[PDB]
């Protein structure tokens, strides 16, 4: 078995190997990359996402989210308070202000320590989940707006044609902005490209061990667990590496830098934080190997998780018994 310790793997494809996205994902899985739940892909030196980022300041963040925490430093939830719209140039200036800027630090490890010590005492503002793309239309390789759609994959594998579309999302971050522990909708893959700015630190649980994280979460968030049988779908819970180690939960960590891709694999729980002002682009995707994960994915029916238009068909086709109850949740 390849990668039996489930380590995060880092790949350096050549420009020739960067041509065929599907083939490269399958290659990474032949080497055991998926067992970690997360992989890093460093693009060939010849590649670029676009020519410059000098002209992005007028993108609008219609609904910036202030991420307010409750709990203790290693075990907390966050809720998202909606703020007034602002441009990316306005948000960048805010991120760099004395109130929000990254503190002085020695290295990524010192910064990580400071994040876990102090995150709960601040409420950073995240420009998350903005439909759009920063890839140039002429970028032919690993262009996250030009990937094979999940609807087309389902149709190719299973023969059924379904409604829905699959487009990317932009994330503008600042110091301490946080992504809570989650897997993707319908336990899909994700791919995330850090276009510019400061790094993003990731934590990940191997898919084969995801239920250990879920059992810890039920213990640590007992009211939330009574409310919903899949409450990590709400994407609000944080658990620190120290707490994971104390409870024996297998995980790994890695820091993504500008210019790098990360891939999350089906049922790979992940969480993390931004180091400072940055911009990432991410999208879900599927492969043939996903279908069995999609059929088994948990679902939130309590009503809280509320998701995209395209999830309907995935539930309806892959999970027809659950369909009815899940759709009650969504309506
Ligand atoms: O970058 C973020 O805030 C969150 N990203 C992801 O969970 C992802 O790409 O799958
Ligand atoms: Mg602009
Ligand atoms: Ni994700
Ligand atoms: Zn729920």
Strands ordered across the beta sheet of 278-285: 9-11, 38-41, 261-264, 189-197, 278-285, 169-173, 125-131, 65-72, 75-82, 237-239
What's the CA-to-centroid distance between 298 and ligand 4, angstroms?
10
Do 176 and 119 touch, CB atoms closer than 8 A?
yes
The ligand that comes nearest to the alpha carbon of residue 129 is: 1
Rounded distance between C-alpha atoms, residue 143 and residue 189, angstroms: 16
Neighbours of ion ligand 2 (CB under 5 A): 56, 58
Strands 38-41 and 9-11: parallel
Do 77 and 237 touch, CB atoms closer than 8 A?
yes
Is 67's C-beta closer than 6 angstroms to any atom of ligand 1? no
Rounded distance between C-alpha atoms, residue 313 and residue 70, angstroms: 35
The ligand that comes nearest to the alpha carbon of residue 232 is: 4
Rounded distance between C-alpha atoms, residue 102 and residue 110, angstroms: 12
b/e map of 187-196 (b: 16 or more CB within 10 Å)? bbbbbbbbbb
**Angle between helices 311-318 and 150-158 in degrees, nearest 10:** 20
Is 179's C-beta closer than 6 angstroms to any atom of ligand 1? yes
Structure tokens at 215: 């059992």
Print the domain residue range for 80: 1-331
The ligand that comes nearest to the alpha carbon of residue 54 is: 2
Structure determined via: X-ray
Atom of ligand 1 nearest to the CA of 270: 7
User: Phi, psi at residue 311, to the nearest 5°?
Assistant: -65, -25
Query: How many domains does the chain divide into?
Result: 1
Atom of ligand 1 nearest to the CA of 262: 9
Cβ-in-10-Å burial (0-12, 13-18, 19+) of 184 comes to: buried
CA within 13 Å, CB half, 55: 6
* Residue bearing the CA closest to ligand 1, atom 2: 179
* Residue bearing the CA closest to ligand 1, atom 10: 190
What's the CA-to-centroid distance between 259 and ligand 2, angstroms?
20
CATH number at residue 323: 2.60.120.650
Atom of ligand 1 nearest to the CA of 126: 3
User: Phi, psi at residue 127, to the nearest 5°?
Assistant: -95, 75
């Amino acid at each position: 078995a390849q990668n039996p310790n489930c380590n995060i793997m880092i790949f350096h494809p050549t420009k020739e190997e960067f041509n065929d996205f599907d083939k490269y994902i399958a290659y990474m899985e032949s080497q055991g990359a998926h067992r970690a739940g997360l992989a890093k892909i460093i693009p060939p030196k010849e590649w670029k996402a676009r020519e410059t980022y000098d002209n992005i300041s007028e993108i609008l963040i219609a609904t910036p989210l202030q991420q307010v925490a409750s709990g203790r430093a290693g075990v907390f939830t966050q809720y998202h308070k909606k703020k007034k719209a602002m441009t990316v140039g306005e948000y960048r200036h805010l991120a760099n202000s004395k109130k929000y800027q990254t503190p002085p630090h020695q290295n990524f490890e010192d910064l990580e320590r400071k994040y876990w010590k102090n995150r709960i005492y601040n409420s950073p503002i995240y420009g998350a989940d903005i439909s759009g793309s920063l890839f140039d239309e002429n970028t032919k390789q690993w262009n996250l707006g030009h990937l094979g759609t999940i609807q087309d994959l389902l149709e190719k594998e299973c023969g059924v044609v379904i409604e829905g579309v699959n487009t990317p999302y932009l994330y503008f971050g600042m110091w301490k902005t946080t992504f809570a522990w989650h897997t993707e909708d319908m336990d899909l893959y994700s791919i995330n490209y850090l276009h510019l700015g400061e790094p993003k630190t990731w934590y990940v649980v191997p898919p084969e061990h995801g239920q250990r994280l879920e059992r810890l979460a039920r213990e640590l968030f007992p009211g939330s667990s009574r409310g919903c049988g899949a409450f990590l779908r709400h994407k609000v819970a944080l658990i620190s590496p120290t707490v994971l180690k104390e409870n024996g939960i297998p995980f790994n960590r890695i820091t993504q830098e500008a210019g790098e891709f990360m891939v999350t694999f089906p049922y790979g729980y992940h969480a993390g934080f931004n180091h400072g002002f940055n911009c990432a682009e991410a999208i879900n995707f599927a492969t043939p190997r996903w279908i069995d994960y999609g059929k088994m994915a948990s679902q939130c029916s309590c009503g809280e998780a509320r998701v995209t238009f395209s999830m309907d068909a995935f539930v309806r086709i892959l999970q027809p018994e659950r369909y009815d109850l899940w759709k009650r949740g969504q309506d």
